[PDB]
Paper text:
They catalyze the penultimate step of triacylglycerol synthesis, through the conversion of phosphatidic acid (PA) to diacylglycerol (DAG). Structurally, all lipin/Pah PAPs contain highly conserved N-Lip and C-Lip regions that combine to form two domains: an immunoglobulin-like (Ig-like) domain and a HAD-like catalytic domain.
Mutating polar residues in the active site to nonpolar equivalent residues has been demonstrated to stabilize HAD phosphatases, enhancing structure resolution. The sixth and final magnesium coordination site was occupied by the carboxylic acid group from the sidechain of Asp155 and was located distal to the catalytic Asp146 on the opposite side of the magnesium ion.
Numbering used by the authors: 20 to 46, 57 to 155, 161 to 228, 242 to 321
The structure:
């Protein structure tokens, strides 16, 4: 079974509160350290099946099992903008101290995200693996240049949770002509953590305030990817769908292209943010 933490996304609101996506962690009290500092007065508990949660009282004074911590708890993390190291430490009287490590990202309310499917969109095709999946040409250079203009790449996986750590290793090992894949969270479809892609992106959209549109563009390889992005606030002009021949359709302009050509027009399609 899985041991680790799905990448966590936290967003600072314009009133300075914090909202986050659900914490999915798997290995009794659980303590937290962020950027190698122990966080005081924060703890999680664990269900029999191994999933962990934040205990929170409801108005009837019953303990509710929350995956989304309150803003006050999140403020105690002292998160920095961007990537942060997070470790969860489960203490058991029978099995001792157990530690898992993951990634927690802090964005601002005006941060702009660019979504990328992994399988079929990064890999060329959509249980026995060695990490040698072929990668579409030129995708690392393009995504690098998107990130350099101020956007944040967010990766999406629909593979089972057993493959999550493998997917992270696969993306961080890609090297194309010296270019690498920009670091960013890998979100996991909630069906794999026991219409799902569209529910996930709407969840992500909703940790940002309603008066901004945080998801700027999306890269996919199926028509269902396009629908998921549209209903999460991406304009059709900014949805890119690639096929197994590495031909990219820019849906809005009904244009055919490629990662290489999109990269040529990077300042047109992904203009630099201030």
């Amino acid at each position: 079974s899985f041991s680790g933490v799905v990448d966590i996304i936290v967003v600072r609101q314009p009133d300075d509160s914090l909202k986050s996506m659900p914490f999915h962690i798997r290995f009794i009290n659980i303590q937290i350290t962020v950027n190698d500092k122990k966080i005081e007065d924060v703890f999680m508990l664990m269900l029999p099946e191994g999933a962990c949660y934040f205990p929170e009282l409801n108005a009837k004074n019953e303990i509710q099992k929350k995956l989304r911590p309150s803003s006050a708890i999140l403020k105690k993390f002292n998160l920095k903008n961007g990537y942060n190291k997070i470790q969860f430490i489960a203490e058991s009287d029978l099995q001792g101290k157990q530690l898992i490590e993951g990634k927690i990202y802090l964005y601002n309310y005006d941060t702009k995200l660019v979504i990328s499917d992994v399988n079929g969109t990064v890999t060329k095709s959509d249980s026995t693996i060695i990490g040698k999946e072929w990668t579409h040409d030129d995708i690392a250079e393009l995504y690098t240049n998107i990130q350099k203009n101020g956007y944040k790449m967010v990766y999406l996986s629909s593979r089972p949770l057993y493959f999550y750590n493998y997917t992270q290793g696969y993306l961080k090992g890609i090297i194309q002509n010296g270019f690498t894949m920009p670091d960013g969270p890998i979100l996991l479809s909630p069906d794999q953590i026991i219409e799902f892609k569209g529910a996930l992106l709407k969840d992500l959209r909703r940790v940002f305030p309603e008066e901004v549109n945080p998801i700027f563009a999306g890269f996919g390889n199926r028509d269902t990817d396009a629908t998921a992005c549209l209903y999460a606030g991406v304009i059709i002009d900014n949805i890119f769908i690639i096929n197994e021949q590495s031909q990219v359709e820019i849906l809005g302009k009904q244009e055919k292209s490629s990662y290489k050509k999109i990269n040529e027009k990077i300042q047109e399609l992904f203009p630099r943010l201030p």
